[PDB]
RNA sequence: CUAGUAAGCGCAAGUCAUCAGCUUGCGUUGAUUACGUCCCUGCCCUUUGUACACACCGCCCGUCGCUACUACCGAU
RNA sequence: GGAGUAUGGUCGCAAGGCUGAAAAAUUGACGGAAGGGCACCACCAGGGGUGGAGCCUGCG
């Protein structure tokens, strides 16, 4: 809630940018957050063709 | 027996008690003892 | 969208301009306002469109006439800016590949991603071959911290309070905290004035935050000294033996 | 319980996969076989049909400096290197996730880059038979590969990228289309220029040249635009002359020559085609002054054109051994020696034992095709409402009659005696034609989708748009009964050879097994994942299997069932396109199946952990100090020959490694492990503490572990002799380290105090009045008591 | 099967239900051997949420799915 | 006569066969590696049955 716009903070407390983040740790971060949540009449032409 | 077991776990509803919050009376709402 | 009457539309190539004195343009397929131009005073009477290009001429109850030549130019400027962005990001990545530390820090300062910036900070505080007169270990990096600009310093104070908040990155935060104070004078630091210091991001707050984290680390390292005296004790012991 | 196998497969030339190759031979791609044809002659030399794979191949490529070995790439991510000398694949390369699309050879032919729909580009060795390494950029899948060593690539975010080979990372990228995607990459054969054709018909043109500084190799020398504002499929160069070809999938291709970028690059010719090209390809024929442009066209054809080098003409074509648009009907002759096939515009009759087309005829559209008994004439019905009558012997049309007006005649069935035919249109009537004259029409409320006779000429059955079926008698057309119970309109029906049974398959993805006496549904069967188009019994129960039947469905699959036990006895896979027709042998020995493949197939510890980690680190330190002695004696070639695990972990420092194996675990088990560490391991550990003391990393960790090993071994330490020197050295190093860092952060905190004071003195107050009342953070700390 | 725990011994009562081919009480004599450990087999649960200090740590991983967007493919 | 409370008698509806036995979902599905706790259905130390002969209830 106190973070800046283009970046996100970690559980360590490190603000890291979505822009600099690659898809790999993107999916991994989304996976960890999802795991936190988890622990919480027509035509005859159309018919015959 | 087996099918009624199957039935209740399917439409899973349990007569068993839940852990009541330990001091429901004076603290019915229950904010954390933390920073606000 | 009007508080007053519109009194004329002209067609593009939707343009409302009337007694409310704020003109408003849009295209009807979306129907949402594309500009609002307020060179004009209380009441606005008429309107005109350029024959071929798109320049507007606002004129009303006054005798002021103002022309407004030309979404698409915004897309064009964003396109060239994004070409610049991807070029500088790729050469930043190649600076990482080469280990081009100083200019890598420079380009990371412009592009504002503190994570890769901090990885550069780890490398530059631990080069394994630091320059003797240097502050971080690399004198050109000492030069770039000598020639920082104000808003960049302030945002580094933000990244710095964060790297100070976490403890494994506290010492690398302390060294870049340490070289920062040596370079630039205190009157400059106090007369620092950037627009984005409001509430939790204001200067008093972020500063005293850094202060209390450093005070914790200060007491910690003091205890480390006091317990470190034991090896001198045992050295005296084996000297007796 | 006899089973069916993929026995014959034919009736098609090159599908909608790209990247065909010329060698006077044309290696084109079918679905599963990679097949080579002659262009002057209509006869194919061979096909490359691998039994181990089923997937549709979609990338073909010829090795430079090595013809007759070819690398192909399938739908599953596989790369099969085949031989043309022997119709077999020498090697298979399955590293990708899905759908090989773009390939690039080495100029020598030992190195292979493959890029897929799964966005990966994998480089492979061709003498060690391993994927060399994996290259990962590319926010979306790739479009173009080339071997410059270096790699020049482009991908679907309009991104062009140059990578290095010696350094497996990207070196440069740029963007082709401002607000679109690139679609085609063309490299000049001398490595001097590259052209990138994107969505808007826009071809960005770039020049080339053959690390810490501002490297710039590629230059955007400009843009160009073509005539057709379509996505461009391929831009192929001339290997020898100064020409190249741009095509997006249309009836228009453009050849452009090489002499501002508009001044240099002008269209040579714009060629118009009869169909939409899938892929263009080049050919130099031996002994000609011409440019042989081979177009492989999506409407099942090949066409070789001549371009004069300082116009176009249809020089050659392959369209005879296949149809052209889409097969829509079948009729396998009574002798089971030939068949009829009806497609939109083309009808071809084919001999089975040579599995080859014999004759070809033209029409507008074709719904249904069926010979008459004696196999002399064929009856075809078409979308324009019309019936045409051809023959097989004289190869001509006989008659042409508007049966219904423009209503698509959904049904043509012969009378099983062989004297009448029946024709069911999209209108509200359907007509019996005795041969030919119109015997009798029938009127009903809605459109019919299927009708049949009974194998004993006793009953007839119509089957309508209303998801209903009305069965009548054959002699007078009075309603025997009617079947319902499908929610969607029926697509087909088939009754048993003894007329004791019905199967009624509808677009509800299920079939109904009825009885023909009282017409009771013996079984509803929900067994296809899609709308089953057709179903057919065998008439010959002479094998004892007459109540077996095949059900062919839109999701490219047929199932062989037994109605008696109501069970699917077999699944028949094999097609990769929506099946439209099929036909059963009259003896029932084989079947044919024609599909939207446009093809036809015929079927018959932690303490010891950090301890030995320390030990390996000691070995590495000994190697490094002996290597330093060697390079100090002479700067000659002396390799460190470090641990394989260390050079695999990335030439990392051994002290960094043991710092990691020290940094991972918890404080408690750390304390525990160092308590375990024996006194033989203590000097190695202490020397590593010395290394961390000089190379200061994780200061409180090093200090804490130092103190702990002192307190668990102190008397041994003060009793020993050799440790005294090591303790002196680490002591000097640690005092240096601690003093440096403490003075650093003390400088920090003093500066913090003074900047606090001056910022206060800045911010204090400006106005002075009677109100000093205006001159604090707050926190909450809830407590449940 | 780890402290009045195991075994041995008896004397009684016969508790609506079950138990005399026994069951249940209650007294008597009363030990070895552990009483550590998560290494085997395991089982449970941490990697979310749940109160703040001085203190420590420092963004597990996978295959997919689902939702939004992009563009494609070809029939009718 | 009013109010309930019952007991069963009476009537209306429920009581008209496109039929013929065998999902939801931003939260979802399954795993794996590190970290602890536990256990006489685990280790370690020991003991003691039953299982040998016979009697015999009960269970098949």
UniProtKB/TrEMBL annotation, chain A:
Question: Where in the sequence does UniProt note compositional bias of the Basic residues kind?
Answer: 28-39
Q: Where in the cell is it found?
A: Nucleus, Nucleolus
Q: Which family does it belong to?
A: Belongs to the MPP10 family.
Full protein name: Putative U3 small nucleolar ribonucleoprotein protein
Taxonomic source organism: Chaetomium thermophilum (strain DSM 1495 / CBS 144.50 / IMI 039719) (Thermochaetoides thermophila)
The lineage, from the top, is: Eukaryota, Fungi, Dikarya, Ascomycota, Pezizomycotina
Coverage span on the entire protein: 688 to 785 of 785
From TrEMBL, chain C:
Domain U3 small nucleolar RNA-associated protein 13 C-terminal: start-end pairs? 89-238
Indicate the secretion signal residues.
none
Q: Where are the WD repeats?
A: 14-36, 37-77
Report the superkingdom from the record: Eukaryota
Cellular localization per UniProt: Nucleus, Nucleolus
What job does this protein perform?
Answer: Component of the ASTRA complex involved in chromatin remodeling.
Q: What is this protein called?
A: U3 small nucleolar RNA-associated protein 13 C-terminal domain-containing protein
Q: Organism source for this protein?
A: Chaetomium thermophilum (strain DSM 1495 / CBS 144.50 / IMI 039719) (Thermochaetoides thermophila)
Please give the first and last residues shown and the length of the full protein.
640 to 894 of 912
TrEMBL record, chain D:
Task: Establish whether keyword Repeat is in the entry.
Answer: yes
Q: What is the lineage of its organism?
A: Eukaryota, Fungi, Dikarya, Ascomycota, Pezizomycotina
Q: Name one Pfam family in it.
A: Utp12
Could you tell me which residue ranges the Small-subunit processome Utp12 domain spans? 655-755
What InterPro entries does the record point to? Answer: Quinoprotein_ADH-like_sf, SSU_processome_Utp12, TBC1_cilium_biogenesis, WD40/YVTN_repeat-like_dom_sf, WD40_PAC1, WD40_repeat_CS, WD40_repeat_dom_sf, WD40_rpt
Q: What Gene Ontology cellular component terms go with this record?
A: Pwp2p-containing subcomplex of 90S preribosome; small-subunit processome
Main localization, broad class: nucleus
Q: Which organism does this record belong to?
A: Chaetomium thermophilum (strain DSM 1495 / CBS 144.50 / IMI 039719)
Q: By its UniProt entry, which SUPFAM superfamilies does this protein fall under?
A: Quinoprotein alcohol dehydrogenase-like, WD40 repeat-like
**Which molecular-function annotations from GO does this UniProt entry contain?**
snoRNA binding
The listed locations are:
Nucleus, Nucleolus
Q: In terms of domain of life, where is this protein from?
A: Eukaryota
What are the ranges of the WD repeats? 93-126, 320-360, 409-435, 483-524, 525-571, 572-604
Q: Which UniProt keywords apply?
A: Nucleus, Repeat, WD repeat
Write the protein's name: Small-subunit processome Utp12 domain-containing protein
Return the similarity comment: Belongs to the WD repeat WDR3/UTP12 family.
- Its Gene Ontology biological processes? maturation of SSU-rRNA
